[PDB]
Design an enzyme around this catalytic site. Structure first.
Site, PDB file in Angstrom:
ATOM      1  N   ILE E  84       0.859  -1.177   0.000  1.00 42.93           N
ATOM      2  CA  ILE E  84       0.000   0.000   0.000  1.00 42.93           C
ATOM      3  C   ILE E  84       0.898   1.230   0.000  1.00 42.93           C
ATOM      4  O   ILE E  84       1.686   1.436   0.930  1.00 42.93           O
ATOM      5  CB  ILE E  84      -0.952   0.005   1.207  1.00 42.93           C
ATOM      6  CG1 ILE E  84      -2.067  -1.030   1.025  1.00 42.93           C
ATOM      7  CG2 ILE E  84      -1.550   1.387   1.407  1.00 42.93           C
ATOM      8  CD1 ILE E  84      -1.687  -2.442   1.421  1.00 42.93           C
ATOM      9  N   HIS E  90       7.700   6.014   0.183  1.00 43.75           N
ATOM     10  CA  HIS E  90       8.506   5.107   0.992  1.00 43.75           C
ATOM     11  C   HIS E  90       8.399   3.666   0.513  1.00 43.75           C
ATOM     12  O   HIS E  90       9.354   2.895   0.662  1.00 43.75           O
ATOM     13  CB  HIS E  90       8.091   5.209   2.461  1.00 43.75           C
ATOM     14  CG  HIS E  90       8.885   4.330   3.376  1.00 43.75           C
ATOM     15  ND1 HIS E  90       8.451   3.084   3.774  1.00 43.75           N
ATOM     16  CD2 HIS E  90      10.087   4.518   3.972  1.00 43.75           C
ATOM     17  CE1 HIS E  90       9.350   2.542   4.575  1.00 43.75           C
ATOM     18  NE2 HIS E  90      10.353   3.391   4.710  1.00 43.75           N
TER      19      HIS E  90
END
Lengths: 157, 157, 157, 157, 157, 157, 157
Positions: E84, E90
């Site tokens: 996700i 990130h």
């Protein structure tokens, strides 16, 4: 006086082709496959020299072509698929992996693998590139495969 | 006193070059090829030492150069193409795959493959980089190929 | 079981073609002519079977094709031109008259006359349709001429 | 090796031309006629080989050229006129009918009829196309007539 | 008459599968694994022919599949994961590395590795693709693995 | 009844680990290394079984791990780094190259290389992922390394 | 069959060049001079055949080149300078006078004087044209000087 070596679309004798087509987005990949087969028929390519391999998705294309390209049974590999992105990035990884797999299959086997996988944002664009105003991507892929096979078997050996 | 090893553009004797040019966007790739051939002629490169290979698209360039680079018949490979992106991402995969294929051909064969493939957003930019205010990308690619061939055959052996 | 009669692009033996190209907008009509000639060469059409007729403008195309179509020396006629409209209606009459003349030449002579005349608003569009992202209109016109000549000489007689 | 048949602007011997000029918008059609006559004189076309026919308007041009083209006395027909549209559609029918008549005269008689009729929106545009920054349309029409007559009498017979 | 080679979902006899599932985002990867196991059970795949390998994250998937694909104990590899993204970058590196590792494992071992790793922006999208309105990605991955194993063991050998 | 093979975090006997940590962004990479070493100590991993290798930057990590993974002295490799992007793309290439190098080291050596390199936009995010509200990335990387080493040495051999 | 006379960049034997470089904007004119000298060295031009003349400003260039061009000691003159305009017209006179002086020196002496003087609005543009994305203007000026000297000494005599 510079030698210009090009592949021939008329010298199709003795050339065998494998077509890898993904079943995902079949509403786009089936007209592409039909266009590719029609192009093969229009250029005197026999049915017994054409093998159509079905895969569930584009991600599995690169593994199949590498499998088909390392067997020596085909002179060119056609990779047909359709990756409609949309407003999300869920299919960006699939498209990038399909492109990388097709490139690796072309480079790691010596048999030219043709990237006929559509990567369009909308489905109207895919429809227009699968037999619409932008032509049929499958027909162009089949012509590219014929030209590359002729180049590899008659000029780059 | 540090040895600075550079390739020579005047010591072109005994150097053979292969030019892979894509037929797609021929309105851009043909002036690039003409510029590359003019640069080769201006630097005393003979016609029999230059082979021009035509491919349907940029995606097929990387497979051809690897084929040409592993034959030993050429000291440098020129990859000429034009990928105009536009407002969509339909050609981003093609450009990335062409760049990756040229890099792999340069790295997996030992013959320096020159990336002369234009990747511009508009066509005016491509025109300006194919003989316009930004010079001819094909001429620069030919000069780079000559310098790299000289470096590999006279300084890095 | 329905008979599907199509023209063949490989059975080019014995077919002669006449190419009518307008000198106006030569920056567009010359790449179109080069693409058409390249397509003819790629499909085993001999040079002595191709005649290129130059006309000052598109308006004079329809009179020439009718002249060429009524001689019996050619099996297909290629009409190459470029009409860039712009922001005015000065060239709308020229484009309409060129289209009507090509249609009349095709219908009043029995020799299929191919409409390869570009009618685009800008010049960037014409460039993109003369060897750009939209392909080469001259190459498509040459392929259409070959297919129509084959259909008329081998299936519609 | 492809035969390129073009008309010659220097081999004007034995060529007779008829110029049909409309009297409407004479402020534009008279400089056009003067430019056409000057071009004819500059290319060694004799006065006795040039006939100037005056018509009240452009609509009557197509009937006259067909009359002149079916007599065999001329090798090319020049149709000079000026249709300034303006903000209304009163002259659109006149311009369309003039274009259709010139095309029919060129096609139904075998004598190339040159469309030198200006169809501009403003009168400044007509002035600029009748000897202004855009050149003289009559001179271009005369050159086109000479080239077409040479092509029809020396290369398309 | 063109041979269409497809994998069979009913001829599951003698086929062994390895499922690599990441423990990160287990709220998504566990329903995916359950769907894959249910699909395997529904298609007569025995429990002793299925091995489930747990990895801490998606980045470690590619190393495990390559380890599993080079052992010869399995005919297809299933890579289950969930990345996700959110509003930051990130996890973009993790997703790209997972895709590249799965592709390399599929290409460098000859055993088809199935990319069943979800790459969605929100978690609602992941939930909908893990047994929601978009179906179960694990079930689709298991079906793809069965089809690819059948194709590789019964049609591409 | 499906075999679920997982790595054990308690069977750390006989396992040696190498930790590659970049000196760039040491304010982030040093707490990550301390967390990894604390996790190793908490799971009965002896000091003589842990080697810490310092590299100037993340780009040099992939070359070192491949060097460490091909020696056979370690069962798992930990790659610790921090790439803070910011508002520019100066560090995007560094992060992508570090990820690719870690993946290649994991895939081209058979020793699982753990990607513990932080790729965050701000430095507050890196601080929160180096012992803040998001935990310590180094501790998670050490746990992943222990689990992967146990899986490779006790279940995937 | 039309004779195309061009200067040769490889036949540099016996050619002597004088380089006039202004000391004003030395941060730009020094990289230009270094690029010109590097180009001269790369094309087998000996150091004793190159004379570098320093002038305080661009205005004094035209007087020096005329002095150097009328001596017969050089076959080409290189005029290197940098005129950054800015938001005022204080340097417009200097740039115009430098251009006029270089043109007069080229025309009133018979020795080709090369205009390598940068006339840019900002200093970033000058930096980009002195070894940046736009290349090195000094290198281009040196190549132009070599080509012009070859043309004047081997083809225009």
């Amino acid at each position: 006086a510079v030698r210009h070596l090009t592949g021939s679309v008329t010298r199709t004798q003795g050339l065998r082709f494998a077509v890898v087509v993904a079943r995902f987005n079949e509403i786009i990949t089936r007209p592409l496959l039909e266009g590719a087969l029609g192009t093969f028929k229009n250029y005197s390519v026999q049915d017994e020299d054409i093998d159509v391999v079905w895969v569930p998705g584009c991600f599995e294309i690169g593994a199949v072509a590498t499998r088909l390209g390392k067997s020596g049974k085909y002179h060119a590999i056609i990779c047909i698929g359709a990756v409609i992105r949309g407003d999300t990035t869920h299919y960006d990884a699939v498209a990038n992996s399909a492109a990388s797999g097709v490139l690796s299959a072309g480079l790691n086997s010596g048999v030219p693998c043709i990237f006929g996988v559509l990567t369009c944002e909308d489905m109207d664009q895919a429809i227009n590139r699968a037999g619409g105003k932008s032509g049929n991507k499958g027909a162009e892929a089949a012509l590219t495969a014929i030209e590359m096979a002729s180049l590899f078997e008659h000029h780059l050996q």
